[PDB]
């Protein structure tokens, strides 16, 4: 019988302006208050590779495992993804610029419980 | 002494078999903690404050802080049980789970030592923060001065400790413990739940019992100095009587 | 050399241990922790790079012509380094009011030994063990 | 060096032993309360059911 | 005086090393706050009220308001700790987290200042609003006048502040602080949790200790004037002893 | 056993009538009470460019990063999006008119916790 | 009237670095604190078979029923799956490397009640 | 303001190893604690016919209504379904093997309130 209103998530985003021609945005779940993230949107100002990494350290990134998820070309948005990472699992997402020049990257999603 | 064991099932008229009490030791090796200060006679005259008394207080405090570092470093590094919270149920549940790990090894803890971040999260726990869940509003009101904080999960003492007191190995002359003291990131140890009768702080002084403060004058340089000394070790007698809480 | 504690900046105590506290006259304005050499008769000025110019570190800030105290050899001292130093690195004056490694300098021997490692622009702890003057 | 305790630890004094020996783990004793206890007159016996 | 440190682990017969009390200062310079009013002779006579007594009261009030502005601007701008609520858990948990920040730098705060918007949010907090979770209905019924609102998170004092008191730089001849005072939007500072003894209102006056009121006649124009002055600065002795709550 | 009725979290909308030939609807998460927004729908009375911006300032838009998400042409509805923005991440959504005249724009979605 | 904020799930992930040419990653629901898992993302550094197994033992894998769900070629991401397994049903998910060389495998999802 | 973590409600599974050439796995909502089930996944080690049945008896399947939902060919996975069954509405799901030999069947999803 009890009626309750549900606000449907806690917001997350990482962004960088003018990241160089081989540099990267590191989406680190340590920056989330709940320790885990689910990235839905990647808006890219040029071509990018998305890479999912595990660290061999609990806190810093030292590559244990790495997989390139997809390559996006041109300027645009990918939306409705569920790219998942957390601190206790030591998971990081790296968006790497592959344009011949600087680009803007804006990734968004929601926090998830650890 | 060795743990308690179990008697054996035996025939009738049969030889009783032996399993005698078996012994070992834990060794203390008290480390000299020292703190010096020097003042020019011209500084000491001109200053409005008594700088020597003030440096005597610094030396006293600095030695005391050293006792606290040795204690906390031993306590955190050498606890034989751990509770992994994995970023979840941090609060009373983590505390009860830590008592759980000690209780599994057949010791009763009575004391807990807490980091500022752990204290913060603990007083955010709805179990303590809501007066109906806690049975009192003392945490909501008086925070750490609440008598319930000194009386959680069968424990009867809370020892609030500072973030700087664990040996990170960043401070000069200190080599660093194995753990990270904190409650901020994955793997940090933010609380220790233990029996206070099973961890020993061993104090040695050659000229009494407590800290010794000595002064000297240099008539060649017009410098007056103050030195403090104390010898301390900390050792567990039963490291299993203790559990760390891990973020 | 200076120490931050919140909003407060505190002056670094240059001397850790030692009794080689020798007195001179300042040939220029000198700052606490600055390496110095003999510029005239019992007169000391700021050390230049690449050796041959070291008697000690200046213990407190002074104007030109004022009496100055040096920590000499056989002092443990807190000194600002211009580069990254590890324990056991030999260091000597960089000429910039700060110390650098013998490995970085054109010189083949140092004046102090690093006891505590530090990053560029930070306070290391060093033990002074030698003097450098004019060999030609 | 000049006379120091770490060179004469078993030469000029013995290391202290604390006179309090310190207990191992003690197990929980409950069975006498947690059960009906029969003080038997014989080693072997029967209860009727 | 510098923070107390830790003694060094030292060898037997080794030299005791120096780390004495190091010192610095906090400067004050008291800004002259002034308020003026002029009344014509004809108006002074004809009014039903004592216009000069009115204007003296106004001038004293305007100076008292100036003191509060200098205090709030220092307090908000120069707090070294911060708790970012990020639009969430604003209320008791935010206050507790602010006390957590001050505790982590090893001061105990005892007081908090609050914006009207923060007060609004705080009394909407289910932890205080629900008598169940609060332990009394005092907040639900008496609001800010409730004894708990001056006894939360270990704090002994609530300093209820006004919306307009902080220096926005929108007031005439006031230049502005660095922050925003409010609780409405990202980056608004809505509360400061602090040690009352570690922030100093500093008052200077040439002719006494407090506000100086001077009257003057203008026999050329038939005006009487009233002027008030005080010099005030506000400074933290330890800015780490305070934390701002951020929206 | 306890049974709760779930109602969806607060509605959000931004709108403009007669936005000129190169002007824009600046959708700002500051206008939401929970501080973050998820735009599902963009109804556009003519052709538009959608742009996602991060500000260098906490409360006004001073462009740090800018990515054009998509170009919509004609009059119609884009729906089922998860275009995500929040005040604390300093994220703004801009819809720019590219028609040869004035148009109407209505964006709708829901609030997310900041 | 009462308004609540919903933070989703509890995060679950299994990972392996350099799993050998014919070896496998065994995703075990016993590693989840709620005892059941729903895998959404499988990231694979080369070609893999996904296999769903029931065990005949309560705690270890002793194969009863086995089904190969699908084979993924190349390097990439599979997202929006719902492969489900739990402890008291003794269900297991095996990712088998088929690439002929060493690969990295990352599975992510969320915990579910037993 | 009150913030809550949502973990998804109970996992459900039925499975059979070596079901014969014309035999079936019968998924019965009586086996769920909440009394009702939603089947997302059907994993089949060979071809199967899926059939949805209503019983004339509250506790045993005595067929009243039957619909063949679909036929799946070869080995594989069907995922993202919402096949729905309840004990109080007396609905059952039958997966029938139609391969020329024995197969393994695993079905999964979640419990729903009856
Ligand atoms: K020498
Ligand atoms: Mg980690
Ligand atoms: Mg961990
Ligand atoms: Mg034995
Ligand atoms: Mg154990
Ligand atoms: Mg009180
Ligand atoms: Mg010496
Ligand atoms: Mg018998
Ligand atoms: Mg120091
Ligand atoms: Mg701080
Ligand atoms: Mg009243
Ligand atoms: Mg903010
Ligand atoms: Mg903002
Ligand atoms: Mg099992
Ligand atoms: Mg079982
Ligand atoms: Mg039925």
Author numbering:
A (entry chain As), F (entry chain Ax), G (entry chain At), H (entry chain Au): 2 to 115
B (entry chain AC), E (entry chain AD): 150 to 396
C (entry chain AO): 2 to 137
D (entry chain AB): 101 to 149
Sentences from the study reporting this entry:
However, the handedness of HFTV1’s capsid is unusual, as most resolved structures of both tailed and untailed T = 7 icosahedral capsids display left-handed (levo) symmetry. The base layer of the capsid consists of gp19, the MCP. The MCP forms alternating pentamers and hexamers, which interact through asymmetric trimers. The interior-facing surfaces of the MCP are highly negatively charged, which has been suggested to prevent the packaged DNA from sticking to the capsid, thus facilitating rapid release upon infection. The trimeric MCP interfaces are bound by trimers of gp18, the capsid stabilization protein (CSP). HFTV1 CSP binds the outer surface of each MCP trimer, thus stabilizing the capsid architecture. Each subunit in the MCP hexamer contains two intermolecular Mg2+ ions, as well as coordinating two additional Mg2+ ions in each subunit-subunit interface.
Here, we present the near-atomic resolution structure of Haloferax tailed virus 1 (HFTV1), an archaeal virus thriving in extreme salinity. Through single-particle analysis, we obtained near-atomic resolution maps of DNA-filled and empty virions, enabling us to assemble full atomic models of the virus pre- and post-DNA release, including all structural protein components. The full atomic structure revealed that the virus has a length of 1350 Å and an icosahedral head with a diameter of ~600 Å. The tail has a length of 560 Å and terminates into a baseplate with three radiating TFs of ~190 Å in length.
